[PDB]
Motif scaffolding. Sequence first.
Motif, PDB file in Angstrom:
ATOM      1  N   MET A  10       0.834  -1.199   0.000  1.00  0.00           N
ATOM      2  CA  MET A  10       0.000   0.000   0.000  1.00  0.00           C
ATOM      3  C   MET A  10       0.868   1.247   0.000  1.00  0.00           C
ATOM      4  O   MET A  10       0.622   2.202  -0.748  1.00  0.00           O
ATOM      5  N   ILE A  11       1.903   1.221   0.832  1.00  0.00           N
ATOM      6  CA  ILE A  11       2.852   2.359   0.921  1.00  0.00           C
ATOM      7  C   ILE A  11       3.560   2.569  -0.403  1.00  0.00           C
ATOM      8  O   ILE A  11       3.729   3.699  -0.896  1.00  0.00           O
ATOM      9  N   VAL A  12       4.027   1.483  -1.000  1.00  0.00           N
ATOM     10  CA  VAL A  12       4.702   1.577  -2.307  1.00  0.00           C
ATOM     11  C   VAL A  12       3.794   2.214  -3.355  1.00  0.00           C
ATOM     12  O   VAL A  12       4.216   3.092  -4.148  1.00  0.00           O
ATOM     13  N   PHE A  13       2.557   1.717  -3.451  1.00  0.00           N
ATOM     14  CA  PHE A  13       1.596   2.312  -4.385  1.00  0.00           C
ATOM     15  C   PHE A  13       1.383   3.804  -4.085  1.00  0.00           C
ATOM     16  O   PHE A  13       1.273   4.621  -5.009  1.00  0.00           O
ATOM     17  N   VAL A  42       9.987   3.810  -8.583  1.00  0.00           N
ATOM     18  CA  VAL A  42       9.345   2.463  -8.468  1.00  0.00           C
ATOM     19  C   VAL A  42      10.373   1.386  -8.099  1.00  0.00           C
ATOM     20  O   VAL A  42      10.155   0.543  -7.186  1.00  0.00           O
ATOM     21  N   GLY A  43      11.500   1.369  -8.800  1.00  0.00           N
ATOM     22  CA  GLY A  43      12.503   0.342  -8.516  1.00  0.00           C
ATOM     23  C   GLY A  43      13.132   0.517  -7.141  1.00  0.00           C
ATOM     24  O   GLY A  43      13.469  -0.468  -6.469  1.00  0.00           O
ATOM     25  N   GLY A  44      13.293   1.755  -6.690  1.00  0.00           N
ATOM     26  CA  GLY A  44      13.807   1.920  -5.340  1.00  0.00           C
ATOM     27  C   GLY A  44      12.826   1.378  -4.320  1.00  0.00           C
ATOM     28  O   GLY A  44      13.210   0.825  -3.290  1.00  0.00           O
ATOM     29  N   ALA A  54      13.059  -7.762 -11.272  1.00  0.00           N
ATOM     30  CA  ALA A  54      12.216  -6.597 -11.563  1.00  0.00           C
ATOM     31  C   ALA A  54      12.734  -5.367 -10.828  1.00  0.00           C
ATOM     32  O   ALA A  54      12.824  -4.259 -11.409  1.00  0.00           O
ATOM     33  N   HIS A  55      13.064  -5.510  -9.543  1.00  0.00           N
ATOM     34  CA  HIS A  55      13.658  -4.352  -8.818  1.00  0.00           C
ATOM     35  C   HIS A  55      14.854  -3.809  -9.572  1.00  0.00           C
ATOM     36  O   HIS A  55      14.955  -2.593  -9.836  1.00  0.00           O
ATOM     37  N   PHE A  56      15.824  -4.683  -9.892  1.00  0.00           N
ATOM     38  CA  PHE A  56      17.048  -4.049 -10.363  1.00  0.00           C
ATOM     39  C   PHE A  56      16.965  -3.642 -11.821  1.00  0.00           C
ATOM     40  O   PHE A  56      17.727  -2.791 -12.199  1.00  0.00           O
ATOM     41  N   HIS A  57      16.034  -4.187 -12.633  1.00  0.00           N
ATOM     42  CA  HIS A  57      15.962  -3.613 -13.965  1.00  0.00           C
ATOM     43  C   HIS A  57      15.179  -2.297 -13.981  1.00  0.00           C
ATOM     44  O   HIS A  57      15.409  -1.469 -14.877  1.00  0.00           O
ATOM     45  N   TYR A  58      14.272  -2.076 -13.021  1.00  0.00           N
ATOM     46  CA  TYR A  58      13.706  -0.719 -12.899  1.00  0.00           C
ATOM     47  C   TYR A  58      14.812   0.287 -12.571  1.00  0.00           C
ATOM     48  O   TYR A  58      14.918   1.339 -13.223  1.00  0.00           O
TER      49      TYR A  58
END
Lengths: 227, 43, 259, 58, 79, 46, 98, 84, 514
Positions: free
Chosen positions: A29-32, I350-352, I375-379
């Motif tokens: 939720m926080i990320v979104f 987003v990736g962070g 997915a994290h590190f390619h963002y």
Amino acid sequence: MAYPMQLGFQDATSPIMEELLHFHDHTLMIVFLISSLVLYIISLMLTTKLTHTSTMDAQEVETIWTILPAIILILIALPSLRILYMMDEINNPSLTVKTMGHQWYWSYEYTDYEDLSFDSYMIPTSELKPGELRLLEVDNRVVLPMEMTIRMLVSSEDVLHSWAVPSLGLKTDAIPGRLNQTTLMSSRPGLYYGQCSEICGSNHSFMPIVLELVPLKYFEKWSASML
Amino acid sequence: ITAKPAKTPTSPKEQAIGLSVTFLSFLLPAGWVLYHLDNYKKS
Amino acid sequence: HQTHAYHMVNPSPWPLTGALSALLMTSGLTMWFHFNSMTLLMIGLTTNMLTMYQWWRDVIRESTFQGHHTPAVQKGLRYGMILFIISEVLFFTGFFWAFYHSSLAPTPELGGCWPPTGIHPLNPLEVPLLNTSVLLASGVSITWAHHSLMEGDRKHMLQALFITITLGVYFTLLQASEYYEAPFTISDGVYGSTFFVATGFHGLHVIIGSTFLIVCFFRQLKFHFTSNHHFGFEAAAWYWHFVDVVWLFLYVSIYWWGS
Amino acid sequence: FENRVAEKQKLFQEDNGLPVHLKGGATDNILYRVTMTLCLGGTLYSLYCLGWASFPHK
Amino acid sequence: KIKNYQTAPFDSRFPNQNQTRNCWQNYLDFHRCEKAMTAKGGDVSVCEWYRRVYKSLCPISWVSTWDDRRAEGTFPGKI
Amino acid sequence: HYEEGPGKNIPFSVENKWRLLAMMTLFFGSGFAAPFFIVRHQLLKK
Amino acid sequence: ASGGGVPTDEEQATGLEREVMLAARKGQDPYNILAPKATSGTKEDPNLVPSITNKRIVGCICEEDNSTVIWFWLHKGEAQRCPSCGTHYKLVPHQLAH
Amino acid sequence: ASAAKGDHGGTGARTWRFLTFGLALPSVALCTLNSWLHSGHRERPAFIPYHHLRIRTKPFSWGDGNHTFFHNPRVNPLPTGYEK
Amino acid sequence: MFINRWLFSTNHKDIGTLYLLFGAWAGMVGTALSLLIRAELGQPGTLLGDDQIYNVVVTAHAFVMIFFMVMPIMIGGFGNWLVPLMIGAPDMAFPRMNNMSFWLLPPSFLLLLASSMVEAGAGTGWTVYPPLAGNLAHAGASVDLTIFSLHLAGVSSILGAINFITTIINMKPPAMSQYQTPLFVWSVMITAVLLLLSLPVLAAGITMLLTDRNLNTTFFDPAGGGDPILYQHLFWFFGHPEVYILILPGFGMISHIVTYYSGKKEPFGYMGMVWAMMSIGFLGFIVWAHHMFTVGMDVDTRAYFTSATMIIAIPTGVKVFSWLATLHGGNIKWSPAMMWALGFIFLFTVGGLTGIVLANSSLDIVLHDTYYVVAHFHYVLSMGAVFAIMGGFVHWFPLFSGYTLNDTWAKIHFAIMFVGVNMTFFPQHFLGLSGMPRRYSDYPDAYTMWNTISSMGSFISLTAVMLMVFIIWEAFASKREVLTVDLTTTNLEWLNGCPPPYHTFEEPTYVNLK
Ligand SMILES: CCCCCCCCCCCCCCCCCC(=O)OCC(COC(=O)CCCCCCCCCCCCCCCCC)OC(=O)CCCCCCCCCCCCCCCCC
Ligand code: HEA
Ligand code: HEA
Ligand SMILES: CCCCC/C=C\C/C=C\C/C=C/C/C=C/CCCC(=O)O[C@H](COC(=O)CCCCCCCCCCCCCCCCC)COP(=O)(O)OCCN
Ligand SMILES: CCCCC/C=C\C/C=C\C/C=C\C/C=C\CCCC(=O)O[C@H](COC(=O)CCCCCCCCCCCCCCCCC)COP(=O)(O)OCCN
Ligand SMILES: CCCCC/C=C/C/C=C/CCCCCCCC(=O)O[C@H](COC(=O)CCCCCCCCCCCCCCC)COP(=O)(O)OCC[N+](C)(C)C
Ligand SMILES: CCCCCC/C=C/CCCCCCCCCC(=O)O[C@H](COC(=O)CCCCCCCCCCCCCCC)COP(=O)(O)OC[C@@H](O)CO
Ligand SMILES: CCCCCC/C=C\CCCCCCCCCC(=O)O[C@H](COC(=O)CCCCCCCCCCCCCCC)COP(=O)(O)OC[C@@H](O)CO
Ligand SMILES: CCCCCC/C=C\CCCCCCCCCC(=O)O[C@H](COC(=O)CCCCCCCCCCCCCCC)COP(=O)(O)OC[C@@H](O)CO
Ligand SMILES: CCCCCCCCCCO[C@@H]1O[C@H](CO)[C@@H](O[C@H]2O[C@H](CO)[C@@H](O)[C@H](O)[C@H]2O)[C@H](O)[C@H]1O
Ligand SMILES: CCCCCCCCCCO[C@@H]1O[C@H](CO)[C@@H](O[C@H]2O[C@H](CO)[C@@H](O)[C@H](O)[C@H]2O)[C@H](O)[C@H]1O
Ligand SMILES: C[C@H](CCC(=O)O)[C@H]1CC[C@H]2[C@@H]3[C@H](O)C[C@@H]4C[C@H](O)CC[C@]4(C)[C@H]3C[C@H](O)[C@]12C
Ligand SMILES: C[C@H](CCC(=O)O)[C@H]1CC[C@H]2[C@@H]3[C@H](O)C[C@@H]4C[C@H](O)CC[C@]4(C)[C@H]3C[C@H](O)[C@]12C
Ligand code: CUA
Ligand SMILES: [Cu+2]
Ligand SMILES: [Mg+2]
Ligand code: NA
Ligand code: NA
Ligand SMILES: [Zn+2]
């Protein structure tokens, strides 16, 4: 197991995995919110012809956007670490099982009482029986008693592997010379699948894990029959 | 930024040639290897 | 014509010959380890020495002979040498981490103890202690050489620098003898691995630092240094103190505490 | 020994257009050719060795 | 005493994920105990708790290698 | 001295745009093709 | 005990090192090692900018501790003003005998 | 074991030469004595073919593949024991 | 003249150009490797072969993108071109050593290519963990050629780091303090400190792997009393600073681009931006074991690495908000470089944030070694480092070359790439949450839909890369010469014209102290 078009975690099979689902919901939720807030502020900065290009003082505003993130981090860290330590809590298992990784299959040892051990290999796709799952079935499943606290010990007799079962929230690396411990408790009977989770050579994709959770009396008779 | 008009203008036809040649230089060699993968494995 | 104080260097082949020497040495080591041949490695070692020789020769030509080392240029070279020594400290730090990782948590294969079963360490009060006194003494004598140079005293600079080099050579021969006499080897588990790789890289740096002091000795014989301008000597003395301090850490960690 | 730095300063400051790595005279040219020849020749040899090692040898 | 042994209990000396030393220690303790008992003509039956714990915890191949090395005279632990 | 200015501070010629296209095609194309031919090579071994 | 034999810079420095050393003795800075001290910057009292050509880049830090430096070409002729803060600068071209 | 000398009027070449000949080299001479009084060959222990020692996962790139680089026959057994 | 200029260079611009060409060629290699990965995974079953040839491709993809594309382009390319000009310096401190940092890279790349041509290649992952990377499970030369490739790249960057630190500390105008130098210069100095401290430790660890493979040491071999997990500590002590090395020069270029195309004379919050980069650099050394949450570490250690890792969000968030505050009130020029930077701000965030999800060691149990990590590190890498590279490339191409790109084509290129990378990597979150492992050549059937989409995304990005080559060709083919550049009063690197003369700042800038 995972199912087609799945978006999130596999359904929880253990109380720890259920805890992780709720904590992930909290964190997501926080990320979104933060990612939406940034996208939205971007759009807002970019949608006006009004300008203000003289020098802007920064001190006051940087309090806000250091203190608010610090607070948010603390709201993540507190339930995160609670689950961490609860996963570490003492629980007194009633059974220990060892698994040894190998290139490319798992062996299992149940040596609390008798010398029971066997290898567990992927079923080749050409030998699946109708309805069975490609790359996931094994010839010899890890039968275990449901609703009991099990100590799993993980090691390897060659390269690194890692023993994972996502619906129980388990992933423990398999390191030669080292005996790593984790705890397993299934709330339900059934079949729970995982896959080798540390690159280990030519057939890393093809050395899966299948647990078969049954009542204690069935596990005992199976164990006897596997000697 | 401002700039002079092109000293050697590259017409749409010339750009179509450059873009086609560029694309083919990436696509044909890889396409050839991938087309023949079976002959490599079946060997 | 410039009106800053910095050095525009003439176009030079030595970056390329050095880079190719690195290719030849690494593909040479590969050929030696896997294809039973030393040929490429000997070529790479040779071109590496030729590259170092001509590059640092040219630096001497640029400074002593052409005057390009203004104070600003020297200041940059001081920073460069300090940063270089920092990177070498972190390199050794990795080998000390490996040593402490293995010795603080000795595994069952070792007997669950340190030193491992079957390992009989050298006595740190015998040659290792002698080595410590040798490199500490060389730290005193190079300090004497530095002050003599600053005070304009050619003869005593040369004498003190010769003494420093002689002690460096003494350490190197003592360590070569200790290597030969050691009853354990690099293939004796993690004890031999950490011991020889850590002291072996240190030994190589002692050889490098002694070579640098020897370069300085001949440059001094040829009057290149002034009483105020002598950065090659300063850098060689810094490097030499680094080599002395790495030894003290080795002695305390591996020879003494690890015995 | 005698201090002959002044003579070397004259040599290396001579207005002859030579880069510093050749300004010592003809010996610099020889050592340069030897170095570059070993590097370029060695590099070709290493490519040959890659080619050799790139295929099995029964 | 403690029979109806089910599996090796939690042991405060080895509270972490890495259990290598727990297997090793009980293996040593069992064989130390068995040497002491067999020498002074006692009963190895008192060594049983160590035997059950190490058999529960230790990989079969570790026990087997260690046994082989004890028989060869190359076991590096003190028994 | 060295040549200065646009098109002169680079190690490749831009004097003719079609020769340039060929050079760029070989340059970027060789890099993009190399992994495919390395894969082929490894497949043709075993 | 004590003796000599090490050359001094006065004896043996050469090239640019020697030029820098000799100018410093005279209190001069032909090679720009020091930061110049500002005048009041008025059109009457402009900052005087030495140059060996007919233009040089000026960087102007308008107020003490600004992190932003304002950069512009100063050309020979009438004093020019820093775009941001108006401080005046005038070029004083010469040959490097200065 | 602390220090205790006491110079420092103004460190110079004379003081560091004093330290070189008056403390540093005498220390080396004393440790050189100590070492040449404890030289002499210890008796080599029984060979035991411990599996964590005399590792061979790949032959060495010199000799017969089985001798370490500074192999000393008197004190360095091969994986099969001391040489004759 | 050609050999003197281009093989014996002592000039920071030409060496910068050499690095940009080298990294562009590497980028093609790494792109092709990435399409081979996604071809293998684009439908269920086996395309190429088993996991060995597959993970030689994966392993090379990563080393190429990191060591031969990103770092040479950001540090060797933009660093060498821009840092001396941004401080008015006549070149780098060590202009001849600078050239050896460049020339070590083609041999380093040759050694990596050789590793993939001999034996069966190094199919280890770019982390090169033993025992898989050891001499029993990876017998033969491939892994040793990989180690040596890393040695040479390591030496190249350590000497470059020394060069950049020295240059930036020692060669500013005497009146300019460190707090009057542009943010891109700060970002290079901080990255160079991280390289200086971290690469020697990697060198130590891979040298230990080399000796375990060839000299019968046993640093990582339990039979001798070694530990595979020690290798991981040494590797990741380098490996986490390395990802901040990969992003910090990007952060620097983003600050300049956003400032410039907002029509601002300065970024918002300059000292906060300096503070944030220094804080990131420092915190980046105390977090490495978040790459090891499943190896069996004690719980208190996991608690510490969870907490320390999340702290980094605070200075990074200051940077994001400061970029947004730089846009605020701007006269926004919607140039292609601005679009790259705006895409950076959002996709990097987003990736962070997914990296903060992973920092929680309890959740990381389930996400580790799955596509959620991928997915994290390619963002942050394909939509962060790469977007900053493309932004910097389109922004400064007229300075380096003297010619303009076609902005309409550059906007088309951005649009294509933006679709392609998001189509490639966004579905990978779902694959990771649902448990698809890393480094797999094939997957259970349930995972087909998202793998199919991800692979189609990768072909869109291929089309953007091909278009990029055409765009550069079109610029050099048409020869539109730059006339005037706005905002030179706060962008010194433009003030010597386009391209600047071979020697700039022969007469240094005049800056007084007052
Ligand atoms: C974020 C990068 C850009 C976005 C790129 C793609 C955009 C399109 C999608 C994306 C459109 C934005 C909405 C994102 C979530 C959509 C899926 C979801 O329901 O996620 C659920 C969860 C867990 O799921 C569960 O346990 C419950 C399942 C509920 C099932 C009900 C049905 C839901 C609908 C079906 C979904 C369709 C699949 C979509 C397939 C998408 C394939 C490409 O999965 C996850 O954690 C995924 C973790 C992702 C973490 C990164 C967050 C970045 C967000 C940026 C948003 C700002 C505004 C975007 C504004 C976007 C414009 C910039
Ligand atoms: C550019 C490269 C880059 C960058 C910058 C980062 C940045 C970060 N990464 Fe990393 N990461 C990689 C490249 C990168 N990463 C790679 C390559 C791997 C895999 C290596 C491998 O295994 O091969 C990896 C793996 C990796 C892991 C291991 C996961 C696993 O293997 O199981 C973890 C775990 O903690 C992690 C966490 C983080 C975090 C917390 C940051 C933080 O720096 C991010 C902080 C940024 C933000 C948080 C966004 C901006 C902030 C705001 C808008 C403020 C408000 C926010 C909050 C209040 C939360 N990363
Ligand atoms: C900088 C780092 C980087 C970059 C940019 C990328 C780019 C891409 N990667 Fe990356 N990838 C890694 C670093 C990177 N990757 C790493 C570290 C791993 C882990 C390796 C391991 O597990 O050991 C990995 C693993 C990885 C996997 C997982 C493999 C597995 O677990 O089995 C996949 C799968 O889809 C993937 C796909 C892609 C794709 C489709 C792209 C595409 O987005 C690429 C598209 C093209 C570009 C982004 C253009 C490239 C740049 C240029 C042409 C430069 C232009 C030059 C100038 C302008 C001067 N990568
Ligand atoms: C395997 C064997 C070893 C291998 C080699 C190892 C390393 C060798 C290192 C290099 C040694 C080189 C020696 C060079 C010696 C120089 C002698 C010539 C110079 C000289 O003699 O100078 C005098 C110093 O003398 C002097 O006794 C110098 C005397 C040096 C004494 C050294 C130590 C011996 C002393 C024994 C005394 C024991 C005391 C113990 C108590 C100590 C309490 C601290 C000073 O005189 P001056 O009148 O002011 O003149 C100025 C012009 N020179
Ligand atoms: C003062 C005494 C002498 C000290 C210096 C001696 C030589 C050291 C030379 C280089 C040191 C560099 C690498 C160190 C590698 C190991 C050498 C360790 C030191 C040494 O010499 O170890 C010897 C073994 O040498 C062996 O294997 C073989 C040694 C030769 C092969 C070296 C292989 C090349 C390794 C290259 C490493 C990569 C370079 C680093 C790159 C860093 C980039 C930033 C010990 O002999 P032993 O017979 O086992 O036991 C003695 C029993 N009587
Ligand atoms: C994901 C990240 C987000 C997390 C949450 C973050 C939320 C941030 C929210 C912050 C809101 C702050 C708003 C400040 C705007 C008000 C100030 C302003 O915009 O006005 C300026 C004030 O400048 C001065 O001195 C004082 C200094 C300059 C003030 C303007 C700069 C501050 C701008 C902040 C912009 C934030 C942009 C969004 C970032 C999230 C000018 O004012 P003056 O009266 O002096 O001149 C006016 C002339 N008169 C007097 C004749 C009228
Ligand atoms: C540095 C260069 C010169 C070095 C010379 C050596 C100096 C010593 C430094 C190292 C000190 C620790 C060494 C420990 C070695 C093991 C001995 C030990 O640890 O002994 C213990 C006391 O140690 C103890 O460090 C008590 C503390 C020791 C103090 C030693 C004397 C020096 C103290 C002042 C130093 C000057 C000031 C320095 C500037 C701050 C107890 O005595 P044991 O003998 O164990 O007997 C127990 C019986 O049951 C055995 O049968
Ligand atoms: C068996 C092993 C063989 C292979 C390894 C290497 C072998 C030997 C290398 C020994 C290093 C010798 C370096 C000689 C440098 C001479 C040039 C020099 O010293 O140049 C000086 C500048 O310093 C400068 O560049 C400083 C230049 C510093 C360079 C050296 C730093 C040491 C680097 C060694 C490489 C280590 C790698 C280790 C890896 C594990 C010149 O300025 P001044 O002295 O002020 O003179 C000017 C006055 O005369 C004016 O009045
Ligand atoms: C597995 C086997 C792998 C082997 C890989 C070996 C790879 C490299 C081949 C190396 C060949 C070296 C040739 C000599 C290089 C001398 C560099 C030097 O000395 O650089 C100096 C600057 O670096 C400074 O000072 C301070 C820095 C001095 C550095 C000296 C060189 C070090 C080379 C090894 C570096 C890594 C060491 C280990 C770190 C962990 C001078 O800079 P220049 O720009 O030249 O001139 C500036 C002029 O103003 C001078 O008048
Ligand atoms: C991941 C990156 C790759 C992207 C995909 C590439 C897209 C298409 C490229 C086209 O490549 C060509 O395709 C032909 C087939 O269409 C091949 O001809 C092959 O097939 C023909 C028709 O069967 C025969 O005439 C030829 O002799 C035979 O080589 C040809 O060799 C290959 O160059
Ligand atoms: C100016 C540039 C210089 C380029 C020089 C190119 C030199 C080429 C010489 C060819 O050398 C080959 O390499 C090995 C040694 O030289 C020999 O192999 C042998 O060599 C080893 C000799 O030490 C043995 O250990 C091995 O058994 C065996 O494979 C082989 O016969 C020989 O043909
Ligand atoms: C004091 C220093 C530099 C100020 C200057 O000389 O211009 C400034 C620059 C960035 C500032 C920091 C950043 O703005 C981030 C934090 C902001 C919080 O409001 C206070 C602490 C906080 C950590 C700040 C403390 C301090 O004011 C810093 C570190
Ligand atoms: C010849 C030379 C005088 C210096 C000069 O005026 O040329 C003298 C002075 C200092 C001497 C050196 C120093 O005394 C130190 C060494 C002492 C050894 O006994 C002889 C070699 C030794 C290396 C000497 C060689 C040579 O005789 C030197 C170099
Ligand atoms: Cu076993 Cu991957
Ligand atoms: Cu990390
Ligand atoms: Mg893992
Ligand atoms: Na000095
Ligand atoms: Na596949
Ligand atoms: Zn001003």
